[PDB]
Design a protein around this ligand. Structure first.
Ligand code: BCL
Ligand code: BCL
Ligand code: BCL
Ligand code: BCL
Ligand SMILES: CC[C@H]1c2cc3[nH]c4c(c3C)C(=O)[C@H](C(=O)OC)c4c3nc(cc4[nH]c(cc(n2)[C@@H]1C)c(C(C)=O)c4C)[C@@H](C)[C@@H]3CCC(=O)OC/C=C(\C)CCC[C@H](C)CCC[C@H](C)CCCC(C)C
Ligand SMILES: CC[C@H]1c2cc3[nH]c4c(c3C)C(=O)[C@H](C(=O)OC)c4c3nc(cc4[nH]c(cc(n2)[C@@H]1C)c(C(C)=O)c4C)[C@@H](C)[C@@H]3CCC(=O)OC/C=C(\C)CCC[C@H](C)CCC[C@H](C)CCCC(C)C
Ligand SMILES: CC(C)=CCC/C(C)=C/CC/C(C)=C\CC/C(C)=C\CC/C(C)=C/CC/C(C)=C/CC/C(C)=C/CC/C(C)=C/CC1=C(C)C(=O)c2ccccc2C1=O
Ligand SMILES: COC1=C(OC)C(=O)C(C/C=C(\C)CC/C=C(\C)CC/C=C(\C)CC/C=C(\C)CC/C=C(\C)CC/C=C(\C)CC/C=C(\C)CCC=C(C)C)=C(C)C1=O
Ligand SMILES: COC(C)(C)C/C=C/C(C)=C/C=C/C(C)=C/C=C/C(C)=C/C=C\C=C(C)\C=C\C=C(C)\C=C\C=C(C)\C=C\CC(C)(C)OC
Ligand code: HEM
Ligand code: HEM
Ligand SMILES: [Fe+3]
Ligand SMILES: [Sr+2]
Ligand SMILES: [Sr+2]
Ligand SMILES: [Sr+2]
Ligand SMILES: [Sr+2]
Ligand SMILES: [Sr+2]
Lengths: 40, 280, 60, 317, 258, 318, 60, 40
């Protein structure tokens, strides 16, 4: 896939942390939403 | 059996799925893994339409049961069932036959695809086919889903489905005013026009008056340029026709997609946005 | 109940990338399928509202 | 743009009308259904009146309709007719001040006639009005002039050299369609023929014109719109004329059509000489009645609210 | 008695007439359908030594003659065509089995690379000048204002490698358009045709991609018996080669996927 | 990836073409050409010249007259308010003579403009017919178009003139307006008891669907064999190439049989002409022969029965 | 429930631009999807008239 | 499949443990779903 083995730990790192940040904003939204009007 | 020039192309490979497993011909039809899935979907579909014809809406001995071709009909379940699977003898059958029809059309499309890979031709045909498959899906999958129940689908019967079209059409009072309907109808009519013009042309040049030789490209362009001051040219006319017919299918799909889910009022009323602009 | 495991050999016959995306796709679709099946049935969580149905918080 | 344009979101409210697969179904906007319900709220009744007393015709001077009522009941009946027809104006709207028995103001000769109009309605038209019946509010809605009253209209202008298309225009009265824009005068005032379908497959015994078909189509668009529904509400479009395949609402609508012919012909046209120009169209014809007038886009005026049963003074004898 | 309803009405019998005219039409169309490829190839024919020429229903229509303009010839249909060996061998000896190309797949001239033997003459303008000729032979032609001139773009194959460069542009003298790209090949500076259908432009880069074959395969492009014109035989020959690469040019187009 | 032959990606120009030359008698050609880089984006960029003979001039002439009566009339219906004309245009129209008049030639203000516009339109369409036969002869070609145009003319004639004369009433022809003529269509089905059960209208519908099916299939094919110059259908018809071979084979391997570069053009040709010809027959029997198609379908046992789950009592029968 | 320290290698098999834009597409679609899922049920947040009805009582 | 006999040991390993991680997340979700709302 035209990457080096040196540049996929690098990519994997950025991918994982970014993905986790996204998941974080998601958890905030789901937390505010659960407070303002719990859905379960 | 093969065409007198066919053996030289009947190469091995090109599949998507199956590989040498089903990589063979039967008579003139290509099988392939998707010919098998297709045949299975198809056969069960038809065999079930035969059983529905066998049982009838009130049982095999009642007067509504029938094997008359104009009248055999398999209809969806009531709306009360929503998106749930409904009992077999209450529209369940119709649901399964539908799953089989969608699966068969999709297998057929994928098998035309393996055939393009074998013959090495463009894949314009199965892509174009996929437009009819799409229209069929809106008429059984998308709309009835957006409408919270599978019963919004049309029944599978020669004239009864015509009746579906009729009363659904009439819930909007004057369907002709559906603007997407107006489009799709325009393409269906124009498509039918270009086709008659191309058809007529090819046949008018490769077979001209006795005393004349097969005609030329120069003739072709000169005739329609003579008549209407323009000729779109040979390649493109094949392009247009493909555009018209695929678009005609498109707009049929959208004109029905908006009739319910995105518009409930009569359709002529839609045109109000035009009489009320602040211009008049 | 025979003796050879060594079922890693499976990737010497089956292309890994394509198997990967295949499972991926199937999982998202099976996901949607199942979600639509339960949401259309009794175990439903949306057409309820906890602790009170919300458009019947006001009748007016 | 060439804007885009006119659109509701999914999912619509839906109702199954005919048999599964036949396509006789109905779609509607849930939002707008709720707005129509708030706008089609009924006025609650006034407490029953005990009475127990003499009959109205014994204590009053000019009581030609609400005779057999007890005084109390008559008074109550007067309060309902007041809020129902002209509450911003009160009692004085239909009476000459200081003189309750006088007919020296037209709105009373009319009010009286409308007392016979509702009564005839509630007591003689149940195959149409059922047990919901009608009341002043049905048409008036706190308004002296039914907002949704109609008039025979002349359509748009024509030079002198040519005569009108009779159809072919943008009109909300034929559902925005181009059919003929006044399907009411010939059907909801006069009684011209609506039937055009033949009862025989082969031809030679049905003179219905295509034009007549279009008039029927226009009118039907009118009807549909007034009750706020589509043809599968009353029909099975494979056979518009087939009564066995129709819905019991076609029967009801049939009797309703005749009913509007009676309101318009023997209760409204006659009030034309005592009504002001302010209440008349370009032909001198007066504002009359249609289905919209009462239903105002709902299959049962005010979503089938039962108002009349509370005022016994609204029934014949 | 003035009511004897007849069960037969003009509508029935018009539906009858229609279906009869229909059947004759269908039949006829299927006859024009056998003006080529027929009689079919079975081992029914070979087993019987040929005593079962396969034609089916309906049958074959009497030949029709096309009189080509310009001292061109005369073609008939249906005709008797000389068999041609298959440059491949049966994947299985069972019938209906596909065949594997013999040798180097792009060279085989079997499969997506197969093609018939069209005349070894040229298609002609109305006047009779070689319809398809290069812009170097067709002086008048000219790029359309606002279109990158292909002349000078780099032709690049399917794997990335440069293939050659556009040395010219072939055009239709009958319906003015780019039909063929000319390619001065890198590996041997020989000039080859490249069908427009196989060519994608990358105007911002002045490249002309080609998914068909690899940069290298450009070395084996079938050749022209004259660099200033081309015959019908040669066109099929040129294109079919590239087409072969769609199934051959890689050890993966063969399919499967799973 | 691969060019799809949807959009000519790089064009070329050459001096315009006045065309193959016509014999003595066939008048000069007029106008001198131009190119539209954009038509060119998708097709022959050459625009014109055009041919105009006695025929062509008498047809353009009649046709524009007819267009004026319809239009002017529409402006009149809105009081010469070009604004209102613009506003309701879709709904504007020129209705036909009333029945009261039968087939008599009516007064200007009561339909006579329609009879004149109908008259002039028809003469102009049939003159364009003759035009295409002349333009088709000057080229030694055959009259395949003219046999189709003649079929569509057939439907037209059945709709606005033939059925009306047979029914003895100009009010039965179709009115000139967009929304008006849509309404005419619906009312037509309604008046004769639902046109869906008219066999001929079912066939015409199978044939309209078929023109879309065949042209989409064939057209997609020719593009898929565009790579081998399959668009060059003439020589693939005289001298079969691998385009016509791969083409016939795609379908052969798909649906079990196939046609040829020459024959597909006949299936397509015949399928289109059939639409209009079933279509016209369909309008011909309505009122002339059948008055209520649904009933007709019941008499021939073709209409399905469904359990009667909803029903209404007949007041006419009380 | 731990991280196989060679999971970076997933990017030697699956193309990064495609995985990325794919996620964006699937996510935006799901987003638009769910937003109308909830707006189409009882939990509506638009048609509430909060804190006061916004038109009037009618046309007045 | 242009893999070595060893790169079918490695891939198989990450495949299996990864998959087991998925099945793990699944048991988690199903556990929450059962506690808050048993479905059987
Ligand atoms: C009664 C039903 C319950 C409920 C019961 C369940 C149950 C039970 C399950 C879910 C599961 C899912 N539910 Mg739920 N769920 C509820 C209502 C919702 C609602 C909503 C608007 O109400 C939403 C949006 C969802 C959505 C979700 C998805 C996040 C999730 C996985 C499905 C899928 O496609 O797999 C997509 C497939 C993938 C492979 C992507 C994996 C993504 C997850 C979030 C983890 C990211 C890993 C990432 C892909 C790492 C890749 C490696 C890197 C490339 C290096 N649920 C209702 C209330 N839901 C499933 C789940 O979460 O599994 C634990 C599951 O088992
Ligand atoms: C009822 C009165 C209303 C009205 C109501 C409707 C309604 C309602 C609808 C239409 C639809 C359409 N109408 Mg209408 N319509 C009106 C009047 C007209 C008029 C006219 C002159 O008056 C015309 C020309 C049309 C024409 C059209 C098209 C615009 C469109 C249908 C094409 C289509 O669906 O493609 C789609 C094509 C397909 C779905 C076929 C797909 C093929 C599948 C994949 C494979 C089939 C395989 C099968 C097994 C083949 C059998 C082979 C066996 C194996 C041998 N209508 C009247 C006024 N009309 C329909 C539409 O919009 O389309 C969705 C629709 O829902
Ligand atoms: C058989 C049923 C009815 C009827 C059924 C329908 C239905 C159903 C529909 C139409 C619609 C239309 N009909 Mg019709 N229509 C009738 C017979 C006619 C006749 C005629 C003299 O016989 C004409 C001119 C038309 C014309 C039109 C087209 C304007 C339009 C769709 C375009 C198309 O297919 O184009 C192919 C042909 C061309 C591209 C050639 C050139 C076009 C010429 C110049 C059009 C002239 C009129 C033009 C509208 C005026 C100015 C332009 C406007 C800005 C658009 N109809 C028949 C009698 N017709 C469709 C629509 O939506 O629009 C109402 C539609 O839904
Ligand atoms: C309204 C509800 C009724 C309906 C009533 C009718 C009626 C009535 C008719 C059709 C007609 C047809 N219907 Mg229908 N139709 C229905 C629903 C449908 C449905 C569907 C999915 O439901 C479909 C697919 C169709 C399909 C069709 C087509 C198959 C067919 C006409 C083909 C055509 O273009 O002729 C149109 C082509 C022409 C008219 C020729 C055009 C050439 C002319 C001469 C061009 C001149 C151009 C002009 C000079 C240019 C200058 C412009 C000037 C300004 C005028 N209908 C329902 C049941 N339908 C025909 C029919 O069936 O009759 C039996 C017809 O007349
Ligand atoms: C999208 C633009 C146009 C188009 C294009 C199109 N259609 C196509 C193609 C293309 C390019 C093909 O290549 C493909 C083909 O094979 O060519 C004929 C196809 C096709 N066009 C066909 C149908 C078709 N296309 C239609 C229309 C259209 N297709 C548009 C006009 C129509 C209509 C309604 O006008 C029909 C009926 C098929 C003959 C063929 C695909 C055949 C196929 O997919 O076969 C596999 C399936 C079976 C053999 C049957 C499956 C068994 C089922 C379970 C039972 C049937 C269930 C069905 C839902 C019941 C409906 C009953 C009706 C009586 C109501
Ligand atoms: C298989 C049946 C299909 C079909 C076939 C068909 N149609 C045809 C033909 C055929 C075979 C022709 O030969 C003919 C044609 O020419 O094809 C391109 C035609 C035709 N198809 C057309 C229309 C048409 N066909 C339709 C339908 C169909 N026809 C079916 C789909 C439809 C529909 C229902 O949608 C339409 C709208 C026309 C373009 C053409 C017939 C043209 C014609 O008869 O002309 C009559 C008169 C005029 C156009 C008046 C001229 C007005 C000029 C355009 C203005 C130019 C003015 C200029 C500036 C001069 C200066 C003016 C001075 C007076 C000041
Ligand atoms: C128990 C068990 C095992 C069951 C037994 C199985 C049984 C019952 C066996 C019976 C087998 C038989 C008899 C048939 C098998 C049936 C099959 C599978 C179904 C057929 C499905 C099929 C798609 C049929 C459709 C038929 C029709 C009319 C399709 C419409 C398309 C059309 C109008 C057809 C004719 C025109 C065609 C084919 C054009 C294609 C075509 C086009 C479009 C070109 O452009 C072109 C250009 C240059 C050269 C050639 C061509 C060309 O051939
Ligand atoms: C030898 O071959 C031949 C020639 O070559 C010599 C000819 O020149 C000729 C003569 C032919 C001509 C002169 C052609 C004339 C063309 C006619 C009559 C067709 C009329 C069409 C129009 C007036 C155009 C109508 C359409 C528009 C104005 C654009 C509309 C745009 C819209 C609706 C929005 C765009 C978006 C959509 C439609 C939605 C998405 C679309 C799709 C999904 C469709 C996909 C299409 C493709 C192509 C892949 C013939 C007959 C011939 O056979
Ligand atoms: C402001 O505008 C200016 C430019 C003046 C002009 C604008 C004009 C415009 C915009 C006009 C617009 C016109 C439109 C949109 C017209 C639309 C027409 C449509 C859609 C018509 C649809 C169907 C119509 C049909 C089928 C009509 C059929 C009529 C026929 C066949 C009539 C036949 C009559 C004959 C042959 C007459 C015979 C007369 C005899 C000789 C018998 O008398 C003795
Ligand atoms: C609260 C306000 C009202 C009061 C107190 C009231 C009171 C009365 C009284 C006492 C009578 C009997 C007078 C007599 O004939 O001797 C009467 C008759 C009548 N009032 Fe009213 N009125 C009121 C409002 C209205 C309104 C609003 C209308 C019309 C919309 C109306 C229409 C009539 C008519 C038509 C009569 C004659 C009744 C008949 O012939 O049966 N009144 N009113
Ligand atoms: C917009 C689509 C509609 C169309 C095309 C339509 C068409 C027709 C037609 C053609 C007839 C006459 C049948 C015949 O010729 O014997 C008819 C009759 C009738 N329709 Fe409608 N209709 C529509 C909507 C409605 C609606 C919504 C109602 C009721 C609310 C309704 C109630 C009636 C009644 C009661 C009759 C019988 C009237 C009589 O016979 O005097 N229709 N309709
Ligand atoms: Fe073609
Ligand atoms: Sr039986
Ligand atoms: Sr305004
Ligand atoms: Sr709420
Ligand atoms: Sr509705
Ligand atoms: Sr507001």
């Amino acid at each position: 896939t035209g990457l080096t083995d040196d540049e996929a730990k690098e990519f994997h790192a950025i991918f994982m942390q970014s993905m986790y940040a996204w998941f974080g904003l998601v958890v905030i939204a789901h937390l505010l939403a659960w407070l303002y009007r719990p859905w379960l | 059996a093969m065409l007198s020039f066919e053996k030289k192309y009947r190469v091995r490979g090109g599949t998507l799925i199956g590989g040498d497993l089903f990589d063979f011909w039967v008579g003139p039809f290509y099988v392939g893994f998707f010919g098998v899935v297709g045949f299975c979907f198809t056969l069960l579909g038809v065999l079930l339409i035969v059983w529905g014809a066998t049982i009838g809406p009130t049982g095999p001995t009642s007067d509504l049961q029938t094997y008359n071709l104009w009248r055999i009909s398999i209809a969806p379940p009531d709306l009360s069932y929503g998106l749930r699977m409904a009992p077999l003898t209450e529209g369940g059958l119709w649901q399964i036959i539908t799953i089989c029809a969608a699966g068969a059309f999709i297998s057929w499309a994928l098998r035309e695809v393996e055939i393009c890979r074998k013959l090495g031709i463009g894949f314009h045909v199965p892509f174009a086919f996929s437009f009819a498959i799409g229209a069929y899906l809106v008429l059984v999958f998308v709309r009835p889903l957006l409408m919270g129940a599978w019963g919004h689908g049309f029944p599978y019967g020669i004239l009864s489905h015509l009746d579906w079209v009729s009363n659904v059409g009439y819930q909007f009072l004057h369907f002709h005013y559906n603007p997407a309907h107006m489009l799709a109808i325009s393409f269906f009519f124009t498509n039918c026009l270009a086709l008659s013009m191309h058809g007529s042309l090819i046949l008018s040049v490769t077979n001209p008056q006795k005393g004349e030789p097969v005609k030329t490209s120069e003739h072709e362009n000169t005739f329609f340029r003579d008549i209407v001051g323009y000729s779109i040219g040979a390649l493109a006319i094949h392009r247009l026709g493909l555009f018209l017919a695929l678009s005609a299918a498109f707009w049929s799909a959208v004109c029905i997609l908006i009739s319910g889910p995105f518009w409930t009022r009569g359709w002529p009323e839609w045109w109000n946005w035009w009489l009320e602009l602040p211009l008049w | 109940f025979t003796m050879n495991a060594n079922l890693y050999k499976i990737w010497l016959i089956l292309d890994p990338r394509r198997v990967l995306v295949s499972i991926v796709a199937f999982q998202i679709v099976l996901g949607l399928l199942i979600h639509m099946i339960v949401l259309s049935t009794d175990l439903n969580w949306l057409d309820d509202n906890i602790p009170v149905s919300y458009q019947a918080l006001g009748k007016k | 743009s060439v804007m885009l344009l006119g659109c509701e979101g999914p999912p619509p409210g839906t109702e199954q009308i005919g048999y599964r697969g036949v396509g006789m179904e109905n779609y509607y906007n849930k939002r707008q259904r709720a707005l129509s319900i708030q706008a089609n709220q009924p006025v609650e009744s006034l407490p029953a009146a005990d009475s127990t007393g003499p009959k109205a015709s014994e204590v009053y001077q000019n009581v030609q309709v609400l005779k057999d009522l007890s005084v109390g009941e008559f008074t109550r009946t007067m309060v309902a007719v007041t809020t129902w027809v002209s509450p911003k104006e009160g009692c004085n709207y239909c009476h000459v001040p200081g003189n309750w028995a006088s007919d020296d103001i037209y709105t009373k000769v009319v009010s009286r006639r409308m007392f016979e109009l509702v009564r005839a309605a509630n007591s003689d038209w149940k195959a149409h009005v059922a047990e919901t019946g009608v009341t002043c509010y049905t048409c008036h809605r706190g308004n002296p002039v039914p907002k949704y009253a109609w008039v025979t209209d002349p359509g748009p202008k024509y030079p002198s050299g040519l005569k009108p298309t009779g159809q072919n225009y943008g009109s909300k009265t034929v559902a925005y369609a181009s059919l003929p824009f006044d399907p009411l005068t010939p059907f909801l005032d006069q009684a011209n023929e609506i039937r055009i379908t033949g009862n025989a497959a082969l031809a030679g015994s049905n003179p219905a014109s295509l034009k007549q078909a279009e008039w029927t189509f226009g009118l039907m668009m009118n009807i549909s719109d007034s009750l706020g529904v589509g043809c599968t509400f009353c029909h099975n479009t494979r056979a518009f004329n087939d009564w066995t395949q129709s819905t019991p609402k076609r029967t009801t609508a049939w009797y309703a059509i005749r009913h509007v012919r009676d309101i318009n012909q023997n209760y409204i046209w006659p009030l034309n000489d005592v009504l002001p120009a302010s209440r008349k169209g370009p032909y001198g014809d007066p504002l009359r009645v249609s289905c919209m007038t009462c239903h105002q886009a709902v299959n049962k005026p005010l979503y089938g609210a039962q108002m009349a049963k509370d005022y016994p003074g609204l029934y014949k004898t | 008695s003035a009511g004897i309803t007849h069960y037969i009405d003009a509508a029935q019998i018009t539906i009858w007439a229609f279906w009869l005219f229909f059947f004759g039409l269908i039949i006829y169309l299927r006859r024009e359908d056998k003006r080529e490829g027929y009689p079919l190839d079975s081992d029914r024919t070979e087993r019987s030594g040929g005593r079962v020429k396969v034609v089916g229903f309906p049958d074959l229509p009497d030949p029709k003659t096309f009189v080509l303009p310009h001292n061109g010839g005369t073609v008939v249909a249906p005709r008797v065509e000389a068999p041609v060996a298959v440059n491949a061998t049966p994947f299985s000896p069972a019938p209906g089995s596909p065949l594997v190309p013999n040798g180097d797949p792009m060279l085989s001239g079997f499969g997506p690379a197969a093609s018939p033997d069209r005349p070894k003459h040229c298609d002609l303008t109305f006047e009779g000048l070689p319809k398809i000729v290069p812009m170097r032979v067709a002086k008048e032609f000219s790029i359309a204002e606002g279109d990158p001139d292909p002349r000078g773009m780099t032709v690049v194959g399917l794997d990335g490698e440069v293939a050659g460069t556009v040395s010219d542009v072939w055009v239709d003298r009958s319906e003015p358009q780019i039909r063929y790209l000319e390619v001065e090949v890198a590996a041997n500076k020989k000039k080859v045709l490249l069908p427009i259908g196989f060519s994608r432009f990358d105007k911002k880069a002045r490249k002309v991609k080609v998914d068909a074959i690899k940069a290298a395969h450009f070395a084996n492009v079938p050749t022209l018996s004259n660099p200033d014109q081309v015959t019908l035989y040669e066109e099929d020959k040129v294109c079919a080669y590239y087409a072969g690469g769609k199934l051959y040019a890689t050890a993966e187009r063969a399919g499967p996927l799973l | 990836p691969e060019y799809q032959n949807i959009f000519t990606a790089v064009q070329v120009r050459a001096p315009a073409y006045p065309g193959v030359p016509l014999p003595k008698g066939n008048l000069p050609r007029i106008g001198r050409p131009i190119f539209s880089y954009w038509l060119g984006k998708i097709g022959d960029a050459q625009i014109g010249p055009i041919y105009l003979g006695l025929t062509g001039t008498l047809s353009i002439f009649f046709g524009l007259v007819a267009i004026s009566i319809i239009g002017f009339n529409m402006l009149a219906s809105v009081h010469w308010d070009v604004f209102q004309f613009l506003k309701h245009f879709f709904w504007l129209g020129l209705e036909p003579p009333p029945p009261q008049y039968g087939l008599r030639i009516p007064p200007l203000s009561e339909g006579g403009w329609w009879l004149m516009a109908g008259l002039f339109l028809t003469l102009s369409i049939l003159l364009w017919w003759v035009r295409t036969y002349k333009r088709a002869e000057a080229l030694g070609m055959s009259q395949h178009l003219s046999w189709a145009f003649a079929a569509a003319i057939f439907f037209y004639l059945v709709l606005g003139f033939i059925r009306p004369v047979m029914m003895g009433s100009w009010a039965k022809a179709v009115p000139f307006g967009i929304f008006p003529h849509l309404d005419w269509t619906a009312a037509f089905s309604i008046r004769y008891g639902n046109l869906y059960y008219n066999p001929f209208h079912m066939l015409s519908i199978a044939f309209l669907y078929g023109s879309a099916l065949l042209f989409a299939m064939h057209g997609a094919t020719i593009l898929s064999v565009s790579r081998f110059g399959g668009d060059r259908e003439i020589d693939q018809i005289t001298h079969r190439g691998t385009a016509a071979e791969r083409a016939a084979l795609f379908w052969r391997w798909t649906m079990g049989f196939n046609v040829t570069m020459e024959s597909i053009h006949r299936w397509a040709w015949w399928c289109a002409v059939l639409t209009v010809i079933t279509a016209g027959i369909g309008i011909l029997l309505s009122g002339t022969v059948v008055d209520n198609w649904y009933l007709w379908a019941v008499k021939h046992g073709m209409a399905p029965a469904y359990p009667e789950v909803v029903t209404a009592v007949n007041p006419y029968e009380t």
